[PDB]
Amino acid sequence: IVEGSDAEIGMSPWQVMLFRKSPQELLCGASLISDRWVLTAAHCLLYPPWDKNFTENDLLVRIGKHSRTRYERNIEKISMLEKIYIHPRYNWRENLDRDIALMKLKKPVAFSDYIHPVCLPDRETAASLLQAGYKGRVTGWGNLKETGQPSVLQVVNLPIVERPVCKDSTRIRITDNMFCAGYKPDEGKRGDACEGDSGGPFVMKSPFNNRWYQMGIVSWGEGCDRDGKYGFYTHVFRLKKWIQKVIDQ
């Protein structure tokens, strides 16, 4: 996260760290959606241009974390993966269209003050919140700058941007399965997701029922926090039918 702030304790209890076993390093962000299911970006697990193809045994999910590097004894819970499910129409060749994956945990995670699932939006939640100007929140342990690493989870609040402005900021083809967010150069305010934040959640707090909903997944960008450029997010509601199908089994 570039131009963000340190998160408060228990501020994002659905925040998951995808952790590589060997070498011991941060793989990606992710989110807790139930006691057994974790949501992330497909590119965190499968990305042939960079020879990325992680299997279940290659990683661990670390839930309830705040500190990036420390082992948070009695706070964080470390879970093993049973199975990874990548969207069958995930487009890694061109624009990361349908950049979504699910991970089933071997055992259910016990909820605590620091571990709690986020909601997934329904059609009405998405129609009412996914509006240009409405702000969401992005969290992660990724880079503090494009060109370094935070000690604790970082947070940034960012406005959803009009689809024509997203389209006009890039030469990449934008699909209906994506949305973009961030401030314009005229807005003065800064902020963006960056490398290592991928797979993390873009959340919004419903003013109707006061619940947090995951509207997006940190997907891609061209650099980090560049003027005239915006962060791109996987549109969670547009891919809910696939999510439901995988979970129903």
């Binding site: 076993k21 941060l26 590097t69 082992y71 470390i78 093993m80």
Partner: peptide
Amino acid sequence: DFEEIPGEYL
């Protein structure tokens, strides 16, 4: 720079 995690997590 990552602190070692308990052996039980492989």
